[PDB]
Amino acid sequence: KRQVASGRAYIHASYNNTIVTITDPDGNPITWSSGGVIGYKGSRKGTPYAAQLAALDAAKKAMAYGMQSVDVIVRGTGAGREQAIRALQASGLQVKSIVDDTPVPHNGCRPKKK
């Protein structure tokens, strides 16, 4: 919420954008970022380079709150998933452990027209 060294980062990989939410080890967010926050609009928010800058920026912001250690959690498939991850550990942030939690139904709700 305000001051903790350990924590966790959340990758969210859409196909038209990528966001990242760093939170305390409880769940409550500290800060976040995304392709749009970075500067891009539309398709480019999907770009892997944007995703790179998102994780980077989200990291820098967390760095200030005293963040140093984070377990990464990813959901999505967008071209930027691993790039957010790669950009995370390379951000001097401690990547304790990357995890995949991308939801998927055991057959329930009918999808869109696609």
């Binding site: 480019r44 380079y49 944007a50």
Partner: protein, 155 residues
């Protein structure tokens, strides 16, 4: 170039400095096969280089041409149906040919009357890292980064 790959044409060194770079640079100045005139205008400037600064025109040329070497450019790869302007490497071949071309192109852009007086100034400001030829370089490099997103298409 669908077949082979084309041999990068070879070139007889300078009849003075013994530099192939200068030989090539002359050709860019050359108008309508009049190679003689071109060399003339060049060397006239070459001496003018020293007339202004105690430095010899040798490294003035290298220093200049090296500051107009664009590190990376934007090539438009028309894949995915759309034409994306991807930023990527500049072949060592291009960096030279482009530099020299921009050099002379920007030189001709200068206002001053005599042609050799332009090659001199443009060459000086270039090594000084200030010339208008450098301006095209600073551009192509920025134009490359203003699109670093799509760089994930780098082939």
């Amino acid at each position: 170039a669908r077949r082979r790959r084309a041999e990068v044409r070879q070139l007889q060194p300078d009849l003075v400095y013994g530099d192939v770079l200068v030989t090539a640079f002359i050709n860019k100045i050359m108008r309508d096969g009049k190679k003689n005139l071109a060399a003339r205008i060049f060397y006239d400037a070459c001496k003018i280089i020293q007339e202004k600064t105690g430095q010899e025109p040798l490294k003035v040329f290298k220093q200049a041409v090296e500051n107009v070497k664009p590190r990376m450019e934007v090539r438009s790869r028309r894949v995915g149906g759309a034409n994306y302007q991807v930023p990527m490497e500049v072949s060592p071949r291009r960096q030279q040919s482009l530099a020299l071309r921009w050099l002379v192109q920007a030189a001709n852009q200068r206002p001053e009357r005599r042609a050799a007086v332009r090659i001199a100034h443009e060459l000086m400001d270039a090594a000084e890292g200030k010339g208008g030829a450098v301006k095209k370089k600073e551009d192509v490099e920025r134009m490359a980064e203003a699109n670093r997103a799509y760089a994930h298409y780098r082939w």
